[PDB]
């Protein structure tokens, strides 16, 4: 079960200055990058083209190249149109892609945030505002919905292109998508109060179990931290336990992860 996400960020500082940057994710693996400085979309994996032929990819890239330039002017014009209801600086975020289900099932999405708030989506055959969006956006919506060429292209992208492309990617990227990388753990402490820290690093995929232990007894005081990325597309997590000073003895950190093949990591303090 995989979510493919095209994430676009644009900053418009004033009427003349802007940049648009994109990253593409399949699950938590980066597949593409498109910097404002670059004329072309960059592959960040060898399999980033999926099952598309060179001609299909060139065509799809060309459509995106036209899109980026067109998007930029459109925002600038919509700002002029709504003036002086909205002013620079302006942030626009797009999140577009498809979630892939078993069989031949998928759901596509295209969500738009404005100053960090989700306000607009494409749905069915047209752009629409979502609950909580300001009323002034009805004019941009009407203007966007006037463009039948764009609506036809977006419908095809979302209904057909996205799931077909992602199916190709899942086939082409299988060995990276299914990689297993071992976690390595180590221990330390911080401030008669003592906070023990179990550090767990280098694991892939994300699902992992980390607990403080006294023998067979699970210490139900363990606070699991956030998942933090490493630079090499592996994960980092730490689990903390609060104890009295002197109470350190006999305590262990147990780690469970799919790469270990049942052979858990146990580190005694």
């Amino acid at each position, epitope marked *: 079960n995989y979510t493919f996400r095209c994430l676009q960020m644009s900053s418009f500082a004033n009427r003349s200055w802007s940049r648009t940057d994109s990253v593409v994710w399949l699950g938590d693996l980066q597949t593409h990058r498109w910097s404002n400085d670059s004329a072309t979309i960059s592959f960040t994996k060898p399999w980033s083209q999926g099952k598309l032929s060179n001609q299909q990819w060139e065509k799809l890239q060309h459509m995106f190249q036209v899109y980026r330039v067109s998007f930029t002017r*459109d925002i600038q014009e919509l700002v002029k*149109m709504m003036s002086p209801k909205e002013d620079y600086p302006i942030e626009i975020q797009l999140s577009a892609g498809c979630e892939m289900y078993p069989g031949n099932a998928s759901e596509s999405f295209l969500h738009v945030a404005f100053q960090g708030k989700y306000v607009v989506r494409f749905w069915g055959t047209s752009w629409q505002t979502v609950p909580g969006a300001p009323s002034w956006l009805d004019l941009p919506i009407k*203007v966007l*919905n*006037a*463009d*039948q060429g764009t609506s036809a292209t977006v419908q095809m992208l979302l209904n057909d292109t996205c799931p077909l492309f992602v199916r190709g990617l899942l086939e082409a990227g299988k060995s990276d998508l299914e990689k297993q990388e071992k976690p390595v753990a180590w221990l330390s402490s911080v401030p008669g109060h003592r906070q023990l820290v179990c550090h767990v690093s280098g694991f892939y995929p994300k699902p992992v179990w980390v607990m403080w232990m006294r023998g067979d007894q699970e210490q139900q005081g363990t606070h699991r931290g956030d998942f933090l990325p490493n630079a090499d597309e592996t994960w980092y997590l730490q689990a903390t336990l609060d104890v009295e000073a002197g109470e350190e003895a006999g305590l262990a950190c147990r780690v469970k992860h799919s790469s270990l093949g049942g052979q858990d990591i146990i580190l005694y303090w």
Partner: T-cell receptor
Framework: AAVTQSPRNKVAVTGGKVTLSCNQTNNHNNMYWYRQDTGHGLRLIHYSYGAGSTEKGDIPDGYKASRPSQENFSLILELATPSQTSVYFC??????????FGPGTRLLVLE | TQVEQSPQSLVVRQGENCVLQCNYSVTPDNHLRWFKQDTGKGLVSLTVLVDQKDKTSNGRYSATLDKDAKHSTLHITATLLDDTATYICVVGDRGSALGRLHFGAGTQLIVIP
């Protein structure tokens, strides 16, 4: 959808103030001013997305625009020059791509 | 310029057919309109082409558009004296009010009665 222009024809002097007016009863938000000179396609001077909005086109220099109401879009030449001798076209439209053009205004700025 | 018409001008005899060309570099290209402009007068729309490979007609006018080649032709069948006019090609870069229009400088047709 109908657009009208006044005056239809105008002789003016260098340094004079000339105002070209365009009226439209279609309830169109958007209005556009162009000039046509031989050897060139129509070129955009100023446009407007509604009352109070004026925007620079491709060749805005020497022209001011005014949109006092939904109906009226004016092109103001504060200090007329011989280079502003031309045929001027106003257009209007809604959210759609079609622009509805007025009949044109011929301007001659004499020295 | 981004929109070029050919020929610049031509003279034909009444009853003859003629073809006018428009080539452009406008990106993107949503639609293309042909205008007829009589001397002194304004702009009368003859046809608009919207599709990748398009064909339209309006009486004795017919037109083609090929978006891949960025090329359009206007064909006038059996010309009459009243066809004497400038014919103007216009490319719209959006399917909405957000578009800019890119005008060609026109083709002058003279029809000898």
């Amino acid at each position: 959808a109908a657009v009208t222009q006044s005056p239809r024809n105008k002789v003016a002097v260098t340094g004079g103030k000339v105002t070209l007016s365009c009226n439209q009863t279609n309830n169109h938000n958007n209005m556009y001013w162009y000039r046509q000179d031989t050897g060139h396609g129509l070129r955009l001077i100023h446009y407007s997305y509604g009352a109070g909005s004026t925007e620079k086109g491709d060749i805005p220099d020497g022209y001011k625009a005014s949109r006092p109401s939904q109906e009226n879009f004016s092109l103001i030449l504060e200090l007329a020059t011989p280079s502003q001798t031309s045929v001027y076209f106003c257009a209007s439209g809604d959210e759609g791509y079609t622009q509805y053009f007025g009949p044109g205004t011929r301007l001659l700025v004499l020295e | 310029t981004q929109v070029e018409q050919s020929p610049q001008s031509l003279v034909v005899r009444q009853g003859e057919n003629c073809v006018l060309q428009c080539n452009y570099s406008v990106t993107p290209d949503n639609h293309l309109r042909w205008f007829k402009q009589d001397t002194g007068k304004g702009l009368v729309s003859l046809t608009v082409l919207v599709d990748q490979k398009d064909k339209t007609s309006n009486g004795r006018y017919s037109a083609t558009l090929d978006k891949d080649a960025k090329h359009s032709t206007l064909h006038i069948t059996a010309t009459l004296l009243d066809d004497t006019a400038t014919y103007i090609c216009v490319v719209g870069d959006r399917g909405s009010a957000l578009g800019r229009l890119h005008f060609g400088a026109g083709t002058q047709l003279i029809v000898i009665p």
